[PDB]
Amino acid sequence: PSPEILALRWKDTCAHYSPHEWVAARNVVTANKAALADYFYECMLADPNAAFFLSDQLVKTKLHASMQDWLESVYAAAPTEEYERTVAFQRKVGEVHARIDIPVHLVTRGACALIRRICELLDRDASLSAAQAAATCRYVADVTMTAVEMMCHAYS
Amino acid sequence: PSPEILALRWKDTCAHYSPHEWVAARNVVTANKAALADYFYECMLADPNAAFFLSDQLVKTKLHASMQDWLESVYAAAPTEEYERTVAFQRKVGEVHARIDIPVHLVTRGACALIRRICELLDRDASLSAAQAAATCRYVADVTMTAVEMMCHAYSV
Amino acid sequence: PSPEILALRWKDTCAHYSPHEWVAARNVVTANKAALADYFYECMLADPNAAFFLSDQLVKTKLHASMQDWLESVYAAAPTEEYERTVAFQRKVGEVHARIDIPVHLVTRGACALIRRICELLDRDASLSAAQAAATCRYVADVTMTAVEMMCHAYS
Amino acid sequence: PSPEILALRWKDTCAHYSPHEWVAARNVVTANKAALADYFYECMLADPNAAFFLSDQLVKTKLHASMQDWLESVYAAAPTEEYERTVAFQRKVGEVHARIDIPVHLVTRGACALIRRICELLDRDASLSAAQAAATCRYVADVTMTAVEMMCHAYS
Amino acid sequence: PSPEILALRWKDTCAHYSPHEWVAARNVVTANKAALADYFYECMLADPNAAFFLSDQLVKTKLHASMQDWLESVYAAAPTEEYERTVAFQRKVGEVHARIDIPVHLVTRGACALIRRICELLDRDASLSAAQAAATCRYVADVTMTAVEMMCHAYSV
Amino acid sequence: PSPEILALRWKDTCAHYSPHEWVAARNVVTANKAALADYFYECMLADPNAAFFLSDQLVKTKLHASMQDWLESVYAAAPTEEYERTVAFQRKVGEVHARIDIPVHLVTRGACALIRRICELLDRDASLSAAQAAATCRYVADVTMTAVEMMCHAYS
Numbered sequence: 001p002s003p004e005i006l007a008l009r010w011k012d013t014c015a016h017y018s019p020h021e022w023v024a025a026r027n028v029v030t031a032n033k034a035a036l037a038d039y040f041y042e043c044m045l046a047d048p049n050a051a052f053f054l055s056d057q058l059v060k061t062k063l064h065a066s067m068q069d070w071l072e073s074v075y076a077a078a079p080t081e082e083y084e085r086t087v088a089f090q091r092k093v094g095e096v097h098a099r100i101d102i103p104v105h106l107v108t109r110g111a112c113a114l115i116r117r118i119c120e121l122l123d124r125d126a127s128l129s130a131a132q133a134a135a136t137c138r139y140v141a142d143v144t145m146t147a148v149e150m151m152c153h154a155y156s
Numbered sequence: 157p158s159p160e161i162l163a164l165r166w167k168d169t170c171a172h173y174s175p176h177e178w179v180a181a182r183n184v185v186t187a188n189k190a191a192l193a194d195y196f197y198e199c200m201l202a203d204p205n206a207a208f209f210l211s212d213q214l215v216k217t218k219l220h221a222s223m224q225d226w227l228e229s230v231y232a233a234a235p236t237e238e239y240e241r242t243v244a245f246q247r248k249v250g251e252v253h254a255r256i257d258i259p260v261h262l263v264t265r266g267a268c269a270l271i272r273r274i275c276e277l278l279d280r281d282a283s284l285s286a287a288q289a290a291a292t293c294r295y296v297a298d299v300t301m302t303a304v305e306m307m308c309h310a311y312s313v
Numbered sequence: 314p315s316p317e318i319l320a321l322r323w324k325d326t327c328a329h330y331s332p333h334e335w336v337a338a339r340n341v342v343t344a345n346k347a348a349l350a351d352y353f354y355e356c357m358l359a360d361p362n363a364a365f366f367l368s369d370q371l372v373k374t375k376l377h378a379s380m381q382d383w384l385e386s387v388y389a390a391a392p393t394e395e396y397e398r399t400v401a402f403q404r405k406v407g408e409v410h411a412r413i414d415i416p417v418h419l420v421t422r423g424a425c426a427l428i429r430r431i432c433e434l435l436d437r438d439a440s441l442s443a444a445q446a447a448a449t450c451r452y453v454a455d456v457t458m459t460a461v462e463m464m465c466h467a468y469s
Numbered sequence: 470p471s472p473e474i475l476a477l478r479w480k481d482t483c484a485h486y487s488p489h490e491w492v493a494a495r496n497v498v499t500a501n502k503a504a505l506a507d508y509f510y511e512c513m514l515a516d517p518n519a520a521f522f523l524s525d526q527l528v529k530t531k532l533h534a535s536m537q538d539w540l541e542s543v544y545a546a547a548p549t550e551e552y553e554r555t556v557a558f559q560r561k562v563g564e565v566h567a568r569i570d571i572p573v574h575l576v577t578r579g580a581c582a583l584i585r586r587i588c589e590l591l592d593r594d595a596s597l598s599a600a601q602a603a604a605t606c607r608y609v610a611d612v613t614m615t616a617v618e619m620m621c622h623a624y625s
Numbered sequence: 626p627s628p629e630i631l632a633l634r635w636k637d638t639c640a641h642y643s644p645h646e647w648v649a650a651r652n653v654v655t656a657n658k659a660a661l662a663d664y665f666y667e668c669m670l671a672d673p674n675a676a677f678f679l680s681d682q683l684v685k686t687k688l689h690a691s692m693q694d695w696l697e698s699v700y701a702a703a704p705t706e707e708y709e710r711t712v713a714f715q716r717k718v719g720e721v722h723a724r725i726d727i728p729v730h731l732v733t734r735g736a737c738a739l740i741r742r743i744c745e746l747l748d749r750d751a752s753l754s755a756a757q758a759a760a761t762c763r764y765v766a767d768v769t770m771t772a773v774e775m776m777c778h779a780y781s782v
Numbered sequence: 783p784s785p786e787i788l789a790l791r792w793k794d795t796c797a798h799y800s801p802h803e804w805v806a807a808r809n810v811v812t813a814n815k816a817a818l819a820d821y822f823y824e825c826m827l828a829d830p831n832a833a834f835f836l837s838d839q840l841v842k843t844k845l846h847a848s849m850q851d852w853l854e855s856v857y858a859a860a861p862t863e864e865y866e867r868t869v870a871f872q873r874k875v876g877e878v879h880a881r882i883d884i885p886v887h888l889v890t891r892g893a894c895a896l897i898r899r900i901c902e903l904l905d906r907d908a909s910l911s912a913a914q915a916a917a918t919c920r921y922v923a924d925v926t927m928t929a930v931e932m933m934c935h936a937y938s
């Protein structure tokens with residue numbers, strides 16, 4: 001629909017959680033964003049179906065930086081209240097993947113890898129309580145899947 | 157893309173976790189599946205782009221019961237070592253939604269709703285330790301997204 | 314209850330009228346079949362009770378067309394002398410509604426909507442005489458109800 | 470499903486036509502009510518399937534008269550603005566047939582017989598204009614079907 | 626005509642026989658009542674002056690079962706010493722037929738059909754002696770006709 | 783109906799039995815007809831409801847003879863094949879009772895008294911076998927009730 005309609009959805013999704021979850025998510029992600037980019041592309045490059053669209057060269061010189069930026073954007077949206085900008089960036093990214101025919105199932109898997117690795121990182125935070133750590137993991141899955149849904153509008 | 161091939165992916169994804177996460181996840185899912193189906197279709201019926209594809213009759217007499225069996229299938233797979241049947245079922249399910257042109261992002265949102273609600277139930281289990289609940293929640297996200305990935309193979313062509 | 318038996322009833326019902334009524338009805342129905350299905354499904358979709366059994370997807374991609382073919386089949390039966398096939402189609406259609414428990418009074422109401430609209434269209438026909446348009450309306454209601462009766466065997 | 474609710478539907482249905490159609494229909498129906506019940510029960514009694522639910526005693530001493538009053542009630546409703554009472558009577562009538570399992574397709578067929586005969590009688594009316602007789606037939610079918618729909622609520 | 630008064634007539638008519646005729650009659654009737662009802666309505670449905678009053682629906686859903694209970698009532702009366710209830714029931718039944726103007730001679734014919742068929746069954750009982758069968762047959766005619774007499778009080782006015 | 787139609791009914795009713803039953807019935811009745819008349823009117827005269835229409839005088843001078851004649855007629859019909867005459871006599875007798883308003887229930891009781899007494903007489907015949915005695919009692923009830931039914935046509 002409208003990027004104004006989508007911005008509301010994002011904000012509604014994040015509004016289920018307190019700013020404390022937004023911040024814990026955004027901190028663990030900004031501290032580990034390069035290692036999250038590493039983990040993502042080493043998963044992709046190892047799948048011959050996905051390494052069809054990837055190369056070790058294209059990762060180290062472009063996608064690795066693009067992925068870090070994408071992580072920062074996803075997790076700064078609610079803290080900054082920059083909902084309309086992030087949803088526009090998501091539709092731009094989604095449009096790049098549909099144009100070159102990236103299988104949507106591989107986009108789904110990549111989101112799943114990010115969710116898993118962030119949540120494992122949150123688990124070892126120790127500076128978070130158990131309930132705070134659990135609420136934040138649920139927010140991580142929520143907001144990453146929201147971002148991917150925006151991206152996947154380009155496939156319909 | 158053989159189901160024996162895809163079955164290796166389901167099994168590797170589950171093998172990242174101990175059977176104790178498989179079982180904990182399966183018990184909360186199997187005990188709340190009707191509640192989980194309710195949550196799934198009241199989300200969809202709330203969004204008019206997804207309401208387009210649904211009727212109250214269709215949900216009540218078919219999809220509500222089909223959602224519970226889908227949940228049963230996903231969470232029985234690793235404990236029953238029945239990866240190959242489960243992947244053939246997910247592939248067949250995804251082929252039903254692509255044939256009627258259900259937008260893939262709506263399937264994603266549905267997945268997201270299920271993962272959220274199951275992890276909320278896991279969070280109030282009390283019989284799970286903090287560490288066990290968090291590992292079971294990561295399994296729930298992994299295995300549900302793997303299942304949805306198998307469904308969305310039907311959207312590649 | 315054999316299809317050969319019910320076809321007798323269909324044939325007798327239509328033999329009350331001449332071929333000119335069959336042809337005038339079939340003509341107005343074929344020139345207006347999409348609009349008749351439009352009117353049919355806008356009535357059904359606006360009543361919450363009936364809208365309970367319909368998704369807008371089902372209407373647009375399946376029923377809007379199936380209704381057109383149903384109308385075509387009903388008004389071709391007597392002119393093509395295809396009585397036995399038509400009644401067998403009507404019975405199977407009736408069975409689809411009983412199987413999912415479409416309330417029969419909604420099926421009645423829908424038949425009534427088709428009759429009213431077809432007869433309104435027949436009244437605007439300037440190429441037909443007064444007495445011809447009246448006999449044709451009488452036939453329209455007769456053949457439409459006849460088809461609904463066969464659909465309604467499935468509910469006993 | 471309240472009688473107040475269904476009366477809305479009856480009122481809306483009749484408001485599609487003017488009082489002149491209500492009165493012309495009511496007039497032809499009242500001058501011909503015994504003959505209409507004659508035609509109704511001779512059709513039903515000659516079909517063995519329907520004759521299964523009827524004794525000739527029941528027809529002569531009860532139903533031949535009850536059918537006359539049913540016709541009177543249906544065509545008085547809009548002219549007497551008695552919508553709520555009429556729909557409550559229709560519902561109770563419908564319940565008598567469901568209780569003894571009168572097949573609904575026979576009820577449909579009987580409605581169709583009444584519509585055809587009333588509209589034939591309307592076509593022979595020399596005191597009515599062409600366009601008036603056509604609008605009146607359209608109303609006859611509408612109000613007759615409306616009554617049968619209310620009878621048919623009992624079958625769901 | 627009080628039912629206590631009429632009850633004396635039923636009881637005197639039965640007292641002409643021993644309880645062994647009451648019991649023998651009741652057992653053959655109670656064991657064949659569905660068969661007896663069948664015989665009753667295929668007679669009536671065969672005569673067009675009586676078919677006038679009947680529909681296949683009415684027989685199948687109502688009168689077939691009402692005929693068996695009537696048979697039960699008539700043959701339970703003397704053994705249960707419930708004369709007064711039985712006469713009030715017969716009076717109420719006859720009032721239903723006179724109200725719809727069932728010709729009284731048709732009721733008589735129905736009685737005649739029942740008495741014939743029950744006495745034919747009594748005749749092939751084998752566990753009754755010749756003398757016992759004949760006494761039980763005379764009771765069957767007596768008690769069935771007494772019952773029909775109570776019914777036809779409704780035709781006096 | 784027609785006395786020709788009724789004569790057939792009588793003959794059909796008697797045709798269920800062999801001439802041997804007709805003859806055994808007709809013999810025991812002709813040998814005891816005065817004692818059967820006695821038993822009948824001593825039952826009637828003892829009921830004040832029935833002795834309302836009777837007197838000891840009217841019995842000994844008329845009805846007693848009329849009753850014997852009636853018994854002979856009923857039991858000679860099938861042996862003589864005089865079906866049409868007996869049914870005409872039955873309607874004449876029935877017409878006398880309806881004209882003076884004899885309660886039909888007392889006519890029923892009187893037939894029952896005759897049936898009982900004849901069957902008791904047959905039981906002690908000894909010149910009849912058991913099966914022959916049983917078939918004849920069933921014929922006695924059959925033909926007496928047939929006669930009374932004819933008589934009771936006058937009440938409808």
Ligand code: HEM
Nearest residue numbers: 050053054066067070092093096097102106107110111148
């Ligand atoms: C959650 C999943 C994913 C995220 C967040 C993501 C992120 C991004 C971003 C931010 C860009 C840059 C867009 C731009 O500069 O306009 C991009 C481009 C690209 N992505 Fe993705 N991506 C995902 C999944 C995938 C997958 C599964 C593949 C499989 C090969 C893939 C292959 C590529 C390629 C080849 C480009 C370069 C496009 C070009 O240079 O023309 N991505 N991605």
Ligand code: HEM
Nearest residue numbers: 200206209219222223226249252253258262263266267304
């Ligand atoms: C992860 C998300 C979903 C899951 C697990 C799921 C599960 C299922 C299952 C198990 C069936 C029955 C398959 C069969 O008939 O063999 C089904 C059918 C169906 N689903 Fe879903 N579904 C999902 C998303 C959706 C969404 C988002 C929509 C609509 C907005 C939708 C609409 C339908 C419809 C209309 C059918 C039936 C098609 C028919 O009966 O012809 N589904 N789904």
Ligand code: HEM
Nearest residue numbers: 357363364366367376379380383406409415419420423424
């Ligand atoms: C005049 C009355 C009606 C006519 C002539 C009619 C016509 C038809 C026909 C021809 C089909 C066959 C579709 C197929 O087999 O491919 C169908 C199916 C169906 N109709 Fe109707 N219809 C009537 C009334 C209604 C009403 C009142 C409802 C609901 C309010 C309804 C809902 C449906 C549904 C749910 C299906 C099943 C579609 C599916 O799942 O395949 N119909 N109708």
Ligand code: HEM
Nearest residue numbers: 513519520522523532535536539562565571575576579580
């Ligand atoms: C247009 C359709 C029909 C109409 C308007 C209609 C009218 C009526 C009405 C008003 C009554 C009420 C009698 C009362 O309550 O006193 C009634 C009862 C009844 N009707 Fe219909 N009828 C229709 C169809 C049929 C059909 C098709 C049958 C059988 C083939 C049937 C058989 C009966 C029966 C058995 C009763 C019950 C009478 C009783 O035992 O009291 N009707 N009808």
Ligand code: HEM
Nearest residue numbers: 669675678688691692695718721722727731732735736773
């Ligand atoms: C000895 C002969 C008969 C017996 C024992 C008998 C018995 C009964 C009984 C027990 C009932 C139900 C009473 C009630 O509803 O409370 C009944 C009703 C009825 N009987 Fe008979 N019956 C006899 C003769 C007949 C005959 C000869 C006819 C028609 C030719 C007839 C027609 C009916 C009808 C139409 C009803 C129902 C009236 C209604 O439902 O409104 N009966 N009978």
Ligand code: HEM
Nearest residue numbers: 832835836848849852874875878879884888889892893930
């Ligand atoms: C099976 C039962 C009955 C039979 C066979 C029978 C026989 C007859 C016969 C043959 C006649 C002469 C008719 C004639 O000459 O035209 C007659 C007349 C008469 N019967 Fe009956 N009857 C029966 C029941 C009753 C009952 C219950 C009463 C109750 C009082 C009664 C009172 C009379 C009377 C008073 C007459 C004389 C009519 C007159 O003289 O004007 N009968 N009956």
Ligand SMILES: [Ca+2]
Nearest residue numbers: 123125126133
């Ligand atoms: Ca922790």
Ligand SMILES: [Ca+2]
Nearest residue numbers: 279281282289
């Ligand atoms: Ca916990």
Ligand SMILES: [Ca+2]
Nearest residue numbers: 436437438446
């Ligand atoms: Ca015109």
Ligand SMILES: [Ca+2]
Nearest residue numbers: 592593594602
């Ligand atoms: Ca005219």
Ligand SMILES: [Ca+2]
Nearest residue numbers: 748750751758
């Ligand atoms: Ca024996």
Ligand SMILES: [Ca+2]
Nearest residue numbers: 905907908915
């Ligand atoms: Ca003997």
